[PDB]
Swiss-Prot record, chains A, B:
Family annotation (InterPro entries): Thymidate_synth/dCMP_Mease, Thymidate_synth/dCMP_Mease_dom, Thymidate_synth/dCMP_Mease_sf, Thymidylate_synthase, Thymidylate_synthase_AS
Protein name per Swiss-Prot or TrEMBL: Thymidylate synthase
Role this protein plays: Catalyzes the reductive methylation of 2'-deoxyuridine-5'-monophosphate (dUMP) to 2'-deoxythymidine-5'-monophosphate (dTMP) while utilizing 5,10-methylenetetrahydrofolate (mTHF) as the methyl donor and reductant in the reaction, yielding dihydrofolate (DHF) as a by-product. This enzymatic reaction provides an intracellular de novo source of dTMP, an essential precursor for DNA biosynthesis.
Keyword DNA damage: no
Family: Belongs to the thymidylate synthase family. Bacterial-type ThyA subfamily.
Pathway(s): Pyrimidine metabolism; dTTP biosynthesis
């Protein structure tokens, strides 16, 4: 079954995984150096052993493909995966004349009343982002996010580079090149970034008329983040291929620090007691070819029949 | 035996490797996505199934660790691995009033007389680099090479960053960090680089008092280049550890395009008919701790007993 490598990766970390402390002071079981491989021709690797919200992955990826870094678009899509990131800028700024919010995310875990307060302050921030056009320009622009890294790398000459755009053109004219790389890691920015890109870099490759992509992820939360990263980048591999008029090959996930948070152990064994069902099918709009122009409605997911979702706390 | 993963990698490409054309118009057998793993505690992964010149690897790595980009140092060390790179700048410049040299490297293969002529023009260029101090500053500085990438990344503000230096300090103060990354890939420079860095990026990791390093190499010549890359980076893993007062763990080599040039096939089967002997031992100077200050004499290699070297043409 297609998602087997993920179950394997999970089972493995439980077994060979040595305990290792981390940034967020939660404990983790970690393995360093691991690579898995999905044959995107057998189906779409969206986990069927626990429900993954394809809509979130889809609207996020498009945001990236638009070289966009503002939350307004995700909000317009009911997506809030990046709220806290913009919200935290809002709270540390001169305008935020509201209640206590320092360390909001962590405190939410054991709220004194905090939860409903935080959840409402967010409802405020978000609505304003969506409406106060000037508010959005200030507290809704995350700045250096995958979108600006893939499609607007700032150079030492005050200019901007579209790595992805260029790489697509390369695939079109020199498909056998070994330099089809897009990077998210900028030495200059990581020293003061809130969250240095985990999805550090990826590489395209073509052969036998099929396109492959290898992602190198520096750090991966096996339970929460990995299921999404497999889905984001496999979708990318389809889009880019559909654009270059190529067939889809394999998606290859390489890890630096693959870990399983100590508070996730029960949930993961829970998942490992399930049997995968056949993998869904991705159906892309045949009329559209400029992936940069793709819309939510141009990407269909057929035959997705997953097991109920598993709930677990975001370790911080 | 320690070098087994390399023999495995080679044998594999012969088998699963699909033919794929490339830049240099030589044909290659290629596989995309592969990772191997050497336990640096069992010994040093310098191949014993064919003699690898440790001296070349050693003097090169130091050059890198010095944030140096000039050929003068390698020349002072009998190392010429980077000559053609500086030499080619020399020939395309106003001063080079000499014989035909356009495409010199390729033409050398089937010389009309070219070989001895080229080999002498080089003897000239090199001697001048070593002596004409001003000549060196002009045609001996490669510019953007691993040394300037690891230890002097130019920022958008006309400044310079010492990625490696910083990463070492990080290891010292936050050994459990998942952000111990040094990058060689600069989006701005690759569009006009002669040879974009193959050894694209590496990641440090610490746990149980042992240091590990994972290299991500975009493209790898299995026969010629891989044996060296395994040796360079494993040596790095030892140096950095000796500096941070840690034990050495594993070296992990991940590949993008692992290939075996069509003109190397006989030589590689030749090598695969040999049996590995026990792996050598690396002995580092105990008095010295600042790896940035290491000298050729501070690195000893004990028990190196290899099979005769195998000769093969540099495919271009
Ligand atoms: O696809 C993704 C994106 C993010 N994260 C996680 C990785 C880390 O667990 C956490 C960031 O912690 P640091 O590695 O930066 O310290 O976010 C994932 O697991 N998968
Ligand atoms: O450790 C190393 C350094 C360089 N090369 C090779 C990789 C490629 O075969 C060639 C450069 O060709 P491109 O990939 O840049 O097209 O140099 C290696 O094999 N190993």
């Amino acid at each position: 079954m297609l998602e087997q490598p993920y179950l394997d990766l999970a089972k493995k970390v439980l077994d060979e995984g040595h305990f290792k402390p981390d940034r967020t002071h939660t404990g983790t079981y970690s393995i360093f150096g691991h690579q898995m491989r999905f044959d995107l021709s057998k189906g779409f690797p969206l986990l069927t052993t626990k429900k993954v919200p394809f809509g979130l992955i889809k609207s996020e990826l498009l945001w990236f493909l638009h070289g966009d870094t503002n939350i307004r678009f995700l909000l317009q899509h009911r997506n809030h995966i990046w709220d806290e990131w913009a919200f935290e800028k809002w709270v540390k700024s001169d305008e935020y004349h509201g209640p206590d919010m320092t360390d909001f995310g962590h405190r939410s875990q054991k709220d004194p009343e905090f939860a409903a307060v935080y959840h409402e302050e967010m409802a405020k921030f978000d609505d304003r982002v969506l409406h106060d056009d000037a508010f959005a320009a200030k507290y809704g622009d995350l700045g250096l996010v995958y979108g600006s890294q893939w499609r607007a790398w700032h150079t030492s000459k005050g200019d901007t580079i579209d790595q992805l755009g260029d790489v697509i053109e390369q695939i079109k004219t020199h498909p056998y090149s070994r330099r089809l790389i897009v990077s998210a890691w900028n030495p200059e920015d990581v020293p003061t970034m809130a969250l240095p890109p985990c999805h550090t870099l990826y590489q395209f490759y073509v052969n036998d008329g099929k396109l492959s992509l290898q992602l190198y992820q520096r750090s991966a939360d096996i339970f929460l983040g990995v299921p999404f990263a497999i889905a984001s980048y496999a979708l990318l591999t389809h889009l880019v291929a559909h654009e270059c008029g190529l067939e889809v090959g394999e998606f290859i996930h390489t890890f630096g620090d693959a870990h399983l948070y100590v508070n996730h152990l029960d949930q993961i064994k829970e998942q490992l007691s399930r049997t995968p069902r056949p993998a869904p099918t991705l159906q892309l709009n045949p009329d559209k070819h400029d992936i940069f122009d793709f819309d939510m409605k141009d990407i269909k997911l057929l035959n997705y029949d997953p097991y109920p979702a598993i709930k677990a706390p975001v370790a911080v």
